[PDB]
Every structure is written in C-alpha cells, then in structure tokens.
Amino acid sequence: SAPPQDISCTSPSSTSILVSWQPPPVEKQNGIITEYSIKYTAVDGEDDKPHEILGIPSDTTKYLLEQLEKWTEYRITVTAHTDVGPGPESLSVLIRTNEDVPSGPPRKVEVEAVNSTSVKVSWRSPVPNKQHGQIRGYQVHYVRMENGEPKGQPMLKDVMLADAQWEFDDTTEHDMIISGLQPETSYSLTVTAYTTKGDGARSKPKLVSTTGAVPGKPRLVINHTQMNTALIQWHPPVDTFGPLQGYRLKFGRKDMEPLTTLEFSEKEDHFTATDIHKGASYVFRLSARNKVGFGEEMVKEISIPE
C-alpha cells in the first residue's frame, strides 16, 4: 500500500507545528481511507516520548500540534488507516518550532563607575537553554535614582550584534560605557537580550553611581624674588567638592620639556621656584585634588623684565 503524500510541516508559534498531507494516489490505494494518525517526537527535547494525534477525519488533511517545546525539533510521520487497520507511515520530516524571546536574563551583570559623567556595565549571554533562539542583541536600561527610587524617565542603549559574531556570542565578553550622566548620581541598570522575536527577561537591577567631581582651578599669584627666584603662591578653588588633599605643580622654562613636577599637601600654598632668569619665559601649571582626583590645571606663563 501507499502512505500519505505531500507531507508539509510548518511552525506557526514557538510551541506548535501545523502538519499537512494528502491521501495516497487513489489509483494506488487499496481499501477506503477512514482516518489518519500522526506520530510526533521531540528530538533532543525535555520529553523524548512519542506522542500521537488519533482519529483524524478522513476528509481532514491538516492538524495543529500544540503544547510543544519552544524552539525544539520534532520528527513527524503521518499514517493512513482503512477499515482493516493502519498502512505504511509517511516519510519522516523533522522541523524545529519557532524561536521565542529569552526566558533568562543576560549572565554575569557587573557595574562600576568610570568618572563623574559615565559608568560601565558588563554582561554575557543568557543561559543557552533559556535563549530560545539566536541572540541578536541586548538592551541596557538605566534610570536615575533619588533616595533609593527612580526619578527621571528611563533611557536605553541598544547593542545589535553583527552577523560575524552570532555564532560565538556565548564567548563574547560584552560591555558598554554609558556617558552623558550627572556627577555623584546613582543609576539603576538592567540588561535584556533579544532574538528576532523580541526582548527577553531583564537582569536583576544593579545600582552604580558616577564619581564626584574633581576640584575647580586654583588661583596663582606670582612675584619676582631675589637671586633668580620666583615666589609662587596659590589659593584653593572655591569648588572643592569635598576636602582638598593637595596640589600638583608642573613648572619650568616655556615650551622646554619635560617640566618639573612637585606635589604639595593641602596645607601648603607657596613654593619658591629657582633658576628663574631675567629675559626668559616660564610656565606654571597648578591643579588641586580631592579624593576623586586632580581638577583642571591653572596655567600661567610669566616673563621677567630685564
């Protein structure tokens, strides 16, 4: 006898497969067809047991398999029955149900401050058996926090993978800098992965704050003193953003490199520079530091008249 023909399987959802067939050629049948049956088995699935669709009407040539596993392969045959019994089963067809969105978050989310206007976030792909498809990209969500609660509107940055690193994305080490942020401000960051079907589960939010700002520029006062010296005095910036910790002075002949670098504590606010000769130009560059670091340098060049 002849089996069903025109076997056609398609997946309309991540958990379903539409099976289609036609009766065997009537000139090649024997008895009258009375029903169809389907055999379907998840290959490599959580449930590897064969399942069946029974009692399909003789005039019915399509049937929807449902409650299948997401993005999973199924091997399928169709069999025609007569009043005698079942005939030979069709050729075997294997297709995979559709992709879905990831049910797991990106793995290993880590955050850290960069400077006063930016933070860094790192992550890896979701657990492979929770992706439900080829990961196509990620979205980093971040919202400004105030007293432990979100204040501003959330923003996002989308990262889309290139075709070249679809295949090795489980080994790619992902990271992103978010800039354009406010000094000394807390942000709550989440990361999602996406497939073609859409966005998946979000990581558990992680807090990260930008650093504080560095101090403003100090003010320089310069005097010509005896024996080819100059008294270099300074005043702290009014904007220190916390306790000042010291100063850094770079000085020497103008354009002549390298300059001499000296550091001072916050308690010191003058220095006598030596080898300051009449008829030459000298540069002084002074920055102030807090625990974050040094602010911009106040830069002054002086020329001693002859």
Residue numbers in the entry: 610 to 915
Reproduce, without paraphrasing, sentences from the article in which this PDB structure was first reported:
An understudied class of proteins in phosphotyrosine signaling, the receptor protein tyrosine phosphatases (RPTPs), are a family of single-pass transmembrane proteins whose architecture include an extracellular domain resembling those of cell adhesion molecules (CAMs) and intracellular single or tandem tyrosine phosphatase domains. In vertebrates, this diversity is typified by the leukocyte common antigen related (Lar) and its two homologs RPTPδ/PTPRD and RPTPσ/PTPRS, which form the type IIa family of RPTPs. Surprisingly, we uncovered a tripeptide, Lys-Gly-Asp (KGD), in the Dlar FN5 domain that is similar to the RGD motif in FN10 and is conserved in the Lar-RPTP homologs across species.
We sought to gain further insights into the position of the conserved KGD motif in mammalian homologues of Dlar. We thus determined the crystal structures of the FN5 domain of mouse LAR and the FN4-FN6 fragment of human RPTPδ. The LAR FN5 crystal structure was solved by molecular replacement using Dlar FN5 as the model and refined to a resolution of 1.7 Å, while the structure of the FN4-FN6 fragment was to a resolution of 1.77 Å. A similar conclusion can be drawn from examining the position of the KGD sequence within the structure of RPTPδ FN4-FN6. The three-domain fragment adopts an extended conformation, but the KGD sequence lies at the interface between domains FN4 and FN5, which makes the tripeptide unavailable for binding to integrins. Thus, if Dlar and its mammalian homologues interact directly with integrins, they will use a mechanism that is distinct from the canonical RGD/integrin binding interaction. (D) The crystal structure of domains FN4-FN6 of human RPTPδ is shown in a ribbon representation and colored green.
